[PDB]
Amino acid sequence: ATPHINAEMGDFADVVLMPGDPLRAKYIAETFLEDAREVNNVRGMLGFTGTYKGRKISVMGHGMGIPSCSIYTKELITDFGVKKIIRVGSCGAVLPHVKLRDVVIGMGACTDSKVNRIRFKDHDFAAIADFDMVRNAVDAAKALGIDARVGNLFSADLFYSPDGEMFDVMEKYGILGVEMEAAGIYGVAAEFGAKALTICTVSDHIRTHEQTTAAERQTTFNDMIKIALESVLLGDK
Amino acid sequence: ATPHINAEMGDFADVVLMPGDPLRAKYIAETFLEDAREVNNVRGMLGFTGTYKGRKISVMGHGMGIPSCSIYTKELITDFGVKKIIRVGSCGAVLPHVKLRDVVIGMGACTDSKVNRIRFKDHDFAAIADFDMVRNAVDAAKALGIDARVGNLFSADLFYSPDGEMFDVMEKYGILGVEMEAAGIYGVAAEFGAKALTICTVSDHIRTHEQTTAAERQTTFNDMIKIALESVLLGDK
Amino acid sequence: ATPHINAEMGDFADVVLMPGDPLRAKYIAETFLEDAREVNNVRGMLGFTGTYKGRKISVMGHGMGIPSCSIYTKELITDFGVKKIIRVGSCGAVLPHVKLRDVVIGMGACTDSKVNRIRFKDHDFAAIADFDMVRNAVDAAKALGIDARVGNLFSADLFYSPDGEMFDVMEKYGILGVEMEAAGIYGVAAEFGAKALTICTVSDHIRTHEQTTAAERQTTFNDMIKIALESVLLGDK
Amino acid sequence: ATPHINAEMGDFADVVLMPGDPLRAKYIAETFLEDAREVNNVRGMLGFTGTYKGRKISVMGHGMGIPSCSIYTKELITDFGVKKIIRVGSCGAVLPHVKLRDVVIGMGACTDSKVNRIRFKDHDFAAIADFDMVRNAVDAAKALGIDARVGNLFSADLFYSPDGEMFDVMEKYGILGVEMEAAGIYGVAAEFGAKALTICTVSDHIRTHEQTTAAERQTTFNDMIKIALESVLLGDK
Amino acid sequence: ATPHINAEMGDFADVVLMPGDPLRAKYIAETFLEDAREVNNVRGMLGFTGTYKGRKISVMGHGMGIPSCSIYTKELITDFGVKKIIRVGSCGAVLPHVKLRDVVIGMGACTDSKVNRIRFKDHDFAAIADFDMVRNAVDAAKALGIDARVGNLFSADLFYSPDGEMFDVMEKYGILGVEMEAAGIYGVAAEFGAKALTICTVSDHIRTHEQTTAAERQTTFNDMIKIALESVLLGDK
Amino acid sequence: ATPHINAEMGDFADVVLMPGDPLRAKYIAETFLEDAREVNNVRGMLGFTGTYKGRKISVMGHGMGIPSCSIYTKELITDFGVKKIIRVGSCGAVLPHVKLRDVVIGMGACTDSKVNRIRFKDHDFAAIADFDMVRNAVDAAKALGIDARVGNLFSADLFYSPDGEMFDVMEKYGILGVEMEAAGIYGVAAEFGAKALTICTVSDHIRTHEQTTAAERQTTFNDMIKIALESVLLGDK
Ligand SMILES: c1cn2c(n1)ncc1nc[nH]c12
Ligand SMILES: c1cn2c(n1)ncc1nc[nH]c12
Ligand SMILES: c1cn2c(n1)ncc1nc[nH]c12
Ligand SMILES: c1cn2c(n1)ncc1nc[nH]c12
Ligand SMILES: c1cn2c(n1)ncc1nc[nH]c12
Ligand SMILES: c1cn2c(n1)ncc1nc[nH]c12
C-alpha cells in the first residue's frame, strides 16, 4: 500500500485511465471493462482493474487539481508498476470554434501552477505528453470516426479565476481547453519516469457559460473513453 | 446547484467543517451530528447537514490540495450562504518539539502555490484565519483540557516534494505543520468576504518517527472535531 | 554592543516597544515608564529602559521601512535577549468602514518587499504576529473601552507607490492599514525565534483628505501605548 | 521589404527551412534545391528560394538566439505569407545515450528565456511544435531509415551558462538537446498565427566535451535536411 | 510641507547631501557650510541649508534602507525643487583589493529590493547615477589627492542576510561596496526626473574584522564630504 | 579556434568594436582601418583586424540579441585576450527630446532578458559599462564637436514586442535608446572580468517619425565610429 492507495503491486494494470471523478472511474469500469474488480477506495478515490478486449486495464479517479492528481500518479508510478497514465477529463473552452462535447488531446499543457518551476529551477518546463501516446489517440479517434483536436491545454489552479483577462491570453495562444491537471501529470511523468497523455471532453464554454450537468460529466463522455482504450491497443502493437 | 455540489440554498448550515477525505465527512456526521442528512454526493465528495447541541452544522469533504478545496469553499460561500469554513485535517510536523497528536491551529498559512500571488498582484498576501474563529478554537480546546499550538501552517502543492531542503526552511521559520489546503482556503475567504480557520492534528513527523496507538490517534482526531464544533458555539455567543 | 546599538546584554528588557519616529521613544519613557534610564543613542535612535507597574520595559525607535526595523529587531533579539517586540505606529486606511484614529492590530502583514521571499526560497511566507500577543492587545484594548480591529496590515516598501491600483486590491482583500514595517518585523521574529506584534492607529485615509486635531492625535497615541503596555502585563498572565 | 529582409511577397515559399547559420542555408540551397535564387542578404542573413522535387521551398538563416530568430520568423510570417517554419539546427546533448550526429525532433521546447512569460502573463506557456509537422518529420525519417528521437529541447539564452547544475536538471527531465531557438520560434508561431517545428543534429556533448568543427556544422548535417524536406512533401498530401 | 518634511519651497537648495545617520547632518552643516539655517526637524531628521564657497547646499539625513531614503528623496524632488541628491555614507567591501577607508563611487547599484521591479514591469532597471555627477566626484577626489574607485554598489534590504553565499556572487561580479540605499535613490531620481550619486567610504570588510581608529574615520568622512561638495562646484562648471 | 570563431590567439587586437551587422564590420574595417585582414568568417560573422592611427584594432559583428552577442564577447575575452568591447550600433528613441542622429552612450543598460538574473541569484544586477571607457567616449565626442548623451539603454529580447505599454515605462524612467545587446555584453564583461561600452546612434523614434537624409544618417554613423576609435586612443593614454 501507499499513503493514498490501499493496494499491492499487481493490483493495477500497467496502463491506468484516470478521470478526476471517482464516480466516472466506476462508470468506466462498469461500462467498458470486463471482470472489473475494485482495487482502492481510500478517501473514496475509487480504482478498478479489468480487461478491455482481453487487455488488462485499470481506471481510477485522481481528484481535482494538480496537487491531488500528482499524489495519485506518483504513487501509481513508484509503487504499482504503472507505465502509462491516460487522463480522461473535462475542460472549458475559450476558442469560439470549440464546442461542448468536442474531444481535445493535450500534446502540451500550459499552467499557472508553480509545480514545474519548483522542479525546473524556476525556468520554463514545456509540460508535454508522450508523442507515441498522442499519435495512438489520434489514430484511434480516426478509426472510430471521432473528431479530435491536438494542441495545448491550460492546467489552472483556480477554476474560479480572479483574472478573467487571462482567458483572452489563452485564446490568443490557441489553448484548446482549460482543465486542472495535465501540466502536473506531465511533470510527474517526467520526474518519476513514466509516460502520460491527457484527453478531455469540452464540458463548459467559458465565454458562453453553457455547461453540462454533473450527471452528464459523470456518465456521458463516452467518445473520449473509447479513444483512450483503443489507443492503448494501438500502443501495444 | 453548482457543477461540483448538487444542492440548493438552505441545504448547508452557515458553518461547514471540512476534512479532506469525504469518508471522514461521513464519519464526522455520524459520530457528532444528530438528524444528519446527506446533501451532496457529486464526485463522491460527501456532504452532510445535521445538528450539534441544537445548532445546525454541515460537514463536507474538500479533497486534497489548494485547487480542490478552492472550488468547494468558493461555491459554499457564493452559492450556499456559508459564512464560516473550518478545515479539520492532518498535518506533518517539522519541529522537534511538535509531537504526534498535537493540535495545531493555523492562524496563518505559508504556501508554495501561486494562487495568492495571482490574486494579489504578485506581492505577498499573508494568508490568515479569522481572528475570532482562532480565539474560539483556542478557548474550546482549553475548556476540553487541550493546549493547542497556534501559528503558521505550510500549505504544499507537492506532497512528494522534489525539494527536500524546504523542510529545513520550514523548521527554521517555525512552521507548526505541513498540509495542503489552508493558504488556499484563507485566500478564498478573503477574496469572497467570508471567514475561515484550519485546525490539524499531527499525523507524522516528516523526518523522524515516534510511536502512538490507533486508539490514541483516533481520540485526538475526535478532540479536534470537538474543538471545531464547540468553537462554533462560542462564536454564536 | 552591536553595529547599531551601543549597549550590553541586560540593558534592554525582554519586551521592547518600538515607534517609527525616534522622538516618540523619549516621550513614551517620560510619559509611561518609571525610573527610565538611557540605554542607546547611536544614530540618534534613543533607547530607554524603565518599568510599567513594576514590569521591565524598553522603548526605542525602529526607523522607517522594513530594512531599518529589520536591523534593530534582529540585534535586539540576538544580542540583547529580547523576546517580544511591539511596534506602535501609524497606518493609512483603504477600507471605507475603517475610520481615522481606529486602532488596528496586525495579526498578519502582507508586503511588496522581497525580504521574506529571500528567506523562504521564493515561496509565500505568511508574516504573522504571535497569537497570544494579538489576543493580549485585543483584551487590553477592551478593558480600556476601545474596540480594536484585528486582521492584515500591508507593509509597503514605497510610501509613494507608482501602482495606485494596488490600493484597490488591498481593499478587496480586507487590508486594515498600510504601513512600512510589520511584515519585516514578523519575518525577523520567525527567523530568530522571537515574538512580535504591530499595533497601528489610522492616521489618514489613502484616498481622502480628512483631518485630525493635535489633541486627538496625542490622545489616540497615548491610547495605543496604554494598550501595548497593558497587553504585556496580560501576557505575563 | 521588412526591417531585416529585403524581399517582397512571393519571394519566399510558404515553407522556410531555417538553420541558424546563413552559410548552412547557402549549402542547403546549393545541395538540395534546384534553380535556387538568393532572395535576401541584409545583415548577411542569406535566404534562398528554389524547388525540391518540384515543390517550392525556401531556406534562410535565422542567427543565434531567441531574439535573433524571433525577428526573422515574425517578418516571414507577417509580410511574406510563410505558413510553416522548420528550424534545422544544432544542439548539445546532456543524456548519456544521446550521441553526436543523432537527430532530435522537438515536440516541445523548455527555455530559460523570459519571452514566453512576457507573452503569457508570467505563467508557463508550453512551447510546442505543430503536431502534424512533428508526425510528418517522424514518418519522413522512418522512410529514410534515419533514427530520430521526439521530445523536449531546451532553448538556452546562454551558450556559456554560469549554471552548470542546470544541466543535471535538464538531464533529469529528459531534455534531448540544448539549443537556442525553438521555444522562441514556437512562441512566435503561436503569437503570429503560423506553424513551426525544430529538428536538430547533436553537434556537441555537454558532458564529454566532444564537439564537431565549424565546417562540419555548416556542410555535413545532411540527414536532418532530408528529413525536413521530405516531411514537407508528406504534409502537402 | 510634505508628510516627512516641515518646510516650504525655497528652504532647500537644489543640491542636497544626505548621510544615513541623521546626526551627521548637523556635523556637515557646522563643519563645512557657512550661514547654515535649520529647515527641518520632523522625526528628528534635521535638515540645514547654507553655502559652500558661495554655492547654496542643503544637508539632511535619509535614514537606513531603501524605503526610508525613497521617502525623503521623492519629497525633496517633487515638492522642494531639488535637482541633485548626493548620498554620502559607509559600505562594506567584498573584494580583497578594496581596502578599509577607500572611497567608492556608485556609477550603478545592484539590489535585492523589489522596488525597481515594481516600477519597471518586473524587468531589470539598471539603477544608475548621473554620469556628470560621477565624473565630477572622480575629478574632485583627484584634485584632493584621492583615487576613488567607480563601479557597482549593492544596495541590500537585509543588513543581516540569511544568504551568505550572495557575498561571493557580489565579489565575482565586481561589486565595490555593500550599502542599503543607492539603488533606491537612483530609482527615485529616474522616476521623478532628477539626478543622484552615492559616494561611500569602506567601513569594513564583510568577511574579516579589521579595525580603524576614530581619528581615521573622521578624516575619511571629512574627505568624502569635501569630495561631494567640490564635485558640486565642478558640476556648476 | 572556438565553435563560433575560426581564429587563433593574436589574430584579434585587445580592443574589438562590434556592430550587429557583419557587413557593417566590413564597412568599418574598409573605411577606418589600414592594413586590415579578415580574421573570422564562421557563420558569416565577419571579423577584421587592422590599425587606426598606428593602433591595432579589431572589428567584428555580434549578431542581433543578447544570446548572440553573449557568445562572441565571451569567446573574445576568454580565448582571444580581448580586454575591451565597444558595441557600435543603432537604437530607437522613446523620449521626445532625443532626436534622430543623437549619439547615445549606455553607461547602464536595462533589460527584459533573464540572463543577468541567472547570473545574480535572481536579484537586480545593474548592467554597467566601464567608467573609464565611458569617459574616453565622452571626451572623444567633445573633441569632435559632438555632444553625446550618457544614460540608460534598454536591451530588448523582442524587437516586435507584444507589450506596447513598456515603451511608456521606458520613457517615464528616462531610457535614452532601445537596442538588443548592451545589458548582455555588460553582463559578460562582469562575469569574465573585462570592460565594455555600448555607443548607439538613434535610427528611429519608436512612436513618431522625423525626417533626415541618408547622407546625414551615414555621417552620424561615421561619427559614432570615430568616437569609438578615438576613445581607445585616449584610454591608451
Ligand atoms: C472543466 C472546466 N473547467 C475546468 N474543467 N477546469 C478549469 C476551468 N476553468 C474554467 N473552466 C474550467
Ligand atoms: C499529513 C499531511 N502531510 C503530511 N502528513 N506530511 C507531509 C505533507 N506534505 C503535504 N501534506 C503533508
Ligand atoms: C500612515 C502611513 N502610511 C500612510 N499613513 N499612508 C500611506 C502609507 N504607505 C506606507 N505607509 C503609509
Ligand atoms: C549547439 C550546442 N549548444 C547549442 N547549440 N546551444 C546551446 C548550448 N549549450 C550548450 N551547448 C549548446
Ligand atoms: C557598512 C555597511 N554595510 C556594511 N558596512 N556591511 C554590510 C552591509 N550590508 C548592508 N550595508 C552594509
Ligand atoms: C534600432 C533598434 N531598435 C529600434 N531601432 N527600434 C526598436 C527596437 N527594439 C529593439 N531594438 C530596436
Residue numbers in the entry:
A (entry chain A), B (entry chain C), C (entry chain B), D (entry chain A), E (entry chain B), F (entry chain C): 1 to 237
Extract from the study:
The hexameric molecule of PNP from E. coli can be described as a trimer of dimers. The key role in the catalysis of natural enzyme substrates is played by Asp204, which is protonated, and by Arg217. Closing of the active site is a necessary step in catalysis; it brings Arg217 closer to Asp204 and enables the formation of a hydrogen bond between these residues, with deprotonation of Asp204 and protonation of N7 of the purine ring, which initiates catalysis.
In the WT PNP-N2,3-ε2APu and D204N-PNP-N2,3-ε2APu structures, the ligand is bound in all subunits, as the electron density in the appropriate region of the active site is in this case unambiguous. In both structures, there is one subunit in the closed (chain A) and two subunits in the open (chains B and C) active site conformations; thus, an active hexamer is composed of two asymmetric open–closed dimers (A-C, A’-C’) and one symmetric open–open dimer (B-B’). In all active sites, a phosphate ion (or a sulfate ion from the crystallization liquid) is bound in a typical position, at a hydrogen bond distance from Arg43* (from the neighboring subunit) and Arg87, while in the active sites with the closed conformation, also from Arg24. As there is no pentose in the N2,3-ε2APu molecule, in the case of the WT enzyme, this part of the active site is occupied by glycerol, which was used as a cryoprotectant. In the case of the WT PNP, the orientation differs in the closed and open active site conformations, whereas in the structure of the D204N enzyme, the orientation is identical in all active sites. In the closed active site conformation of the WT complex, N2,3-ε2APu can be modeled in an orientation where a hydrogen bond between Asp204 and N9 of the ligand is possible but, in this orientation, ribosylation would occur at N7. In the second possible orientation, C11 of the ligand is at a hydrogen bond distance from Asp204; thus, the hydrogen bond cannot be created, but ribosylation would occur on N2, which, indeed, predominantly occurs as described in Section 2.1.1. For the WT PNP-N2,3-ε2APu complex, in the active sites with the open conformation, the ligand is “flipped”.
